[PDB]
Symmetry: D2
């Protein structure tokens, strides 16, 4: 095919998703895959479900040469991304799926991630990859910071509403849920089937790394510092994510107004569907696809509204959006190789 | 055994739970059981997992002789219970697990349940079965309305806090989650394994029948009408329930105060455990038991706090509490036959 | 685009799968969909996960006109297909996913299905749709009987082995497992999440309708009547199927021989992968794809071997194979619109 | 309480099960627990679900004083058990849940476990803990080797049948399934929720450590060396185990005979239930209890029969049987503290 792709950090779930998505992409082809501990091995050995594909042997990022690669997807650990990406050739279009380039405020990155920002200058040319919102800036960016999963489900509904002054920016409470696939493939006791199955629990209470990412996006639109309440919850399922958002509507605003604004803002958007009134979205319905379904409901408390937003955390919440961004960055149709329909049941 | 128990509506999950719990209860014995379509059937037919027990043959409510039992557990649906219970013998101690006798305001019952209250008089002698809160009234009641599952997880933490004026009664937002067992054993498409598994969704948005029940309990304590926001969510799991409660602390009140009040209010309570600050409870940890674990956390938004409360929706959320109430109503130790430890993993 | 497709019985899971698969098929387009119990209703109303697709309105079979379509997929309920298919125009290429046309012996169909065959004549022109085995006959057939799920996982491995006289045809024992999606979307108590989850059980012991289908295929190859032992098991999962096959090798034959024969028979086959000796296949690895992975192992009992064969019961076990057959029946590449990669995790 | 219990290796699932079971045991009380790696910590820190119990603080084996307890349950790692038990004081009744003392043939233990038997002498005084079969020997034993999970489900049905010469001892094929809890709490990639959920796979094909254990028990009864075929399968569920056993009936025998023999052999047994012919047992039905349900069915292949045997792998398959054995070893009623009814749903 005419576009050659490099994947940095192919042994994780987001890496596997990239490979899955590109498999039937008409123009992009994976020609370089990097892995650390598994360098030298084929990917079938790491992920046997990919045996129908012919992929290159996994090599070290340090031994990788990009002279025949056109673009790169980075799925490396928080701790490596910044220095590796900084030392990457300039002729490369880069989409970083890590969180290391999402925050524009350096001090902010340091307080939330526990270490100095090691690519301060490069940071100022980075564009946040929330496709439907920053499409125009994304198309002309060289380095794109692909948003996190939760942040994606939150900003898509709230940005348009804040921009139109339809909701107040105080007391925005977000109670989110996610499938355990978002925790990664790391071999940890807490994520074993026996520990996760048949139960739920909150996590990242009060402080979760997605908080600053969420507030940055909302603050930019509200043109005022926005402080939200965000509480993640771990679901006994593989894929799927839902944010149940509790907001205060602006004076005189009704739920119908929020609905109309959303319907208008995303009417021609392939991946963002605004459901009719009273219709409840289900994570089951977007499972395995790059779609996001959202709906608005009145809150029993006068003046308040409830917004539900769902996606497949691994697709539109990660690798799907990453590809969505690379498509337009390379001048190809945005939906290219991203029209997979939900796998239900 | 000393006490002969009658179970009205034994073919459902709450009925099965009653039978399971009483199996090793030293003093209560099931001697009479009612079923609708499955009347005349052996319960090994309806619930083969109960084959180790020697139980009675199921009969129809119309053919059951209630002078043959000492106490009764009612597990019929909402809107049937009132006329049946009203006609039950006066010498019977009754614990109704339905919602038909929970609301004291008649007009309120009618607007939320779609039909006139058919036992208006009897209603005034009914005591709400939230054991740890109304224990003293429950002991001397003849007819007890066993609370709903969600309401139980919400009132246990909030009542003590409202009583002590530690939290404001406005903008109490509740984002709850429940295993699908709470939906019952009814053969509906929406509850099939293929439709429920690997995904979540909200339900009963804006208006859910537990709302008035929740507000009634909170209003009584706050001595002012309390309006809450309550949003249920269906989890891809059998048992388990969690309410993530977002409240505004009263002026000058810190999370430490909420924690101390809860720790003090439930320090000698067997079934309600207050975890150490910062500790996240898990529904997995109370699964198959009558325990409720709760914890308090600071909200990122100044002045706000987060309360997590979990239980097994079928036990402390239903049949377990029902038995807890009958125990004291009959003069037996409250924890009798209710010390089953969580089944984890 | 070029080919117009008619779907009879679109409200079930196999129907939904057909729609999902055709969504990105470059040449086939769904233009007609039958579903009487829900005729005049929108597909999104039945399966909301398909809302990204612009699909036709659901119509009654009676009110449907089939000279509008070039080919038809039949997903009707057993005992309803024969008469309907018998009356279809003859310029229609048909792939029946039901079991009504799989058995060539009429008396056999009657004893196993409880009713007379109502299309005896048409039956003799029907070709069994096990693509990799009867490809050549399938290409020139007008009416194809798409095989059942279990039978597909069994015949693919055994046919080549029997043809090469590498295994005896007596005492072939098959212990199969399947996700509950194979039970359909029918609203039955036994298939509720609460009844299925966290446990397994056998079903169709001794006699299961797939038995005659399995034996027919094996008997044809062995040129002798083959009697097998086949025991289905219901798995607490949506998709996935595995047959663990216990066979007796022929005199002098070793497991290496079975492996080589299979490797040779399917070396150029896209959808049938023979793993390296000793490698254990996983249903997780073919989930959501049209692939079948099989492997051979020595049995501890001398002279015996163990064969594991897995597929996604809804794809290669049903709708995926159906499309695979229609592709070649219409002269298009066999793999057209069937290269979806496994959705793992 | 009367008896003081010591638990060696309390940080694993079998250890947690022991603690759960003893919680309501009227005469046994845990007074010593060993968890080396996590020594000094609280049991609550390891298994927060046990917070309702007041347990002693975790200790190290090298720091435990065994003269303080009357009996011990050993859930230590394989290979660390023989030497530790060999040094335990003579006054202790010991039930080892590991597999290190199950095999009587030393050479056999070495070939299957990869290391020399380090307690050869002690081995000859060990009694296999399959309660219903060796009850009389168990009562007077000091050291009991608690059987493995799979072996328990297999021997209970087969021993009586072999003893009565109702089935041949050749070609006994066992296709077993187990919930992932049997794999332990070890933090391994393969057992993560994302890797296990929604799929199945075989494991321990051809050679699995339970093989020699299974054959030893069967060989002793058949008074001839028995060679079986045993294939384990990993189920996407926590608890539960089923063995589907394919056997050849002896000349002149019918399935009715196998059923009668089993019904007679276990008619007065609390924990082993023989279902009526044709009734299919479900692992769901014994979940969380110490019960075993079995049923016999005719095989389609003349002369063959099918036996299904299920248990909760963690209870009757491990800790439940361990306690069952200790009860009688100490002179207490066998069912003491083991009458927990199945937790269904």
């Amino acid at each position: 095919k005419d576009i050659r792709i490099g994947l940095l950090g192919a042994s994780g779930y987001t890496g596997a998703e990239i490979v899955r998505l590109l498999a039937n992409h008409p123009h992009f082809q994976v020609t370089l895959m990097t892995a650390d501990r598994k360098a030298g091995q084929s990917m079938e050995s790491v992920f046997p479900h990919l045996r129908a594909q012919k992929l290159p042997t996994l090599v070290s990022v340090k031994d990788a040469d990009f002279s025949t690669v056109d673009a790169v997807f980075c799925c490396l650990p928080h701790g490596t991304t910044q220095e590796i990406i900084k030392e990457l050739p300039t002729a490369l279009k880069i989409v970083d799926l890590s969180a290391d380039f999402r925050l524009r405020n350096i001090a902010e990155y340091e307080e939330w991630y526990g270490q100095p920002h090691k690519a301060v200058e490069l940071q100022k040319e980075v564009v946040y990859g929330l496709t439907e919102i920053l499409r125009e800036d994304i198309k002309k960016a060289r380095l794109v910071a692909n948003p996190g999963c939760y942040p994606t489900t939150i900003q898509l509904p709230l940005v348009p509403l804040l921009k139109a002054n339809l909701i107040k920016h105080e007391n925005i409470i977000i109670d989110a849920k996610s499938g355990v696939s978002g925790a990664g493939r790391g071999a940890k006791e807490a994520n074993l089937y026996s520990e996760i199955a048949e139960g739920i629990s909150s996590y990242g209470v009060t402080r979760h790394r997605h908080v600053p990412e969420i507030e940055q996006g909302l603050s930019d639109v509200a043109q005022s510092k926005v402080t939200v309440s965000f509480t993640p919850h771990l679901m006994p399922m593989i894929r799927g994510m839902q944010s149940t958002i509790y907001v205060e509507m602006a004076p005189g605003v009704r739920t119908e107004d929020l609905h109309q604004q959303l319907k208008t803002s995303y009417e021609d958007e392939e991946f963002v569907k605004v459901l009719d009134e009273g219709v409840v979205p289900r994570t089951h319905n977007v499972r395995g696809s790059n779609y996001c379904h959202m709906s608005v409901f009145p809150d029993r408390i006068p003046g308040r509204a409830i917004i539900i937003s769902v996606i497949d955390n691994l697709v539109k919440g990660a690798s799907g959006q990453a590809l969505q961004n690379l498509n337009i960055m390379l001048g190809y149709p945005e939906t290219t190789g991203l029209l997979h329909q939900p796998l239900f049941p």
